[PDB]
Ligand binder design. Structure first.
Ligand SMILES: [Zn+2]
Length: 196
């Protein structure tokens, strides 16, 4: 009733990477290594790098799923709030209830789990292009952390899993997410709070 969040590189050395976007007031997405936390604006591009030490088999996939970080909320499905699930901002593929979308991948699939009712979005794993050392998935988060009746100011984690063609686990990584109006200021504030 709760997905695992244990980091697991697995046989292929799977792990995530993030750009170094800084903390200017204007930044739309920024990652804090010290907090393992992504700060982003609503429905803005969040580039997440996928790194492996060796290429997994054809048919490998990469799944993203959100869970609440606090234990007393972890059994609750993370979903869009009653406002945003009705605002008709569909990309033609993502169900309007799903918090996490993938941008610009026509092979993305959206799952409503028939047993847990949790949402996820999955894409094929592909090796890096010629001259590149990793691949990047562009995610969008479609509600604010503060949305009433949805996340309701509760922190969430995103769990990224590398899966074989049957859905079996090959690798796992994760990061906290805050969706907010001013990611640069909020990253600076929370990093200062950690230091203090
Ligand atoms: Zn919302």
């Amino acid at each position: 009733s709760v997905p695992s969040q244990k980091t697991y590189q697995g046989s292929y050395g799977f792990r995530l990477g993030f750009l170094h976007s800084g903390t200017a007031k204007s930044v739309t997405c920024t990652y804090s290594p010290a907090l393992n936390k992504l700060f982003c604006q609503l429905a803005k591009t969040c580039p997440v790098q996928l790194w492996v030490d060796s290429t997994p088999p054809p048919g490998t996939r990469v799944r993203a799923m959100a869970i609440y970080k606090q234990s007393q909320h972890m059994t609750e499905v993370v979903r869009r709030c009653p406002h945003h699930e009705r605002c008709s901002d569909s990309d033609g593929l993502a169900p309007p209830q799903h918090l996490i979308r993938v941008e610009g991948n026509l092979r993305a699939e959206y799952l409503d789990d028939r047993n847990t009712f949790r949402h996820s979005v999955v894409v094929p794993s592909e090796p890096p292009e010629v001259g590149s050392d990793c691949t990047t998935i562009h995610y969008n988060y479609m509600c604010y952390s503060s949305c009433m009746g949805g996340m309701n100011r509760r922190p969430i984690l995103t769990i990224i899993t590398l899966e074989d063609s049957s859905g079996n686990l090959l690798g796992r990584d994760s990061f906290e997410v805050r969706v907010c109006a001013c990611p640069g200021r909020d990253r600076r504030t929370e990093e200062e709070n950690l230091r203090k």
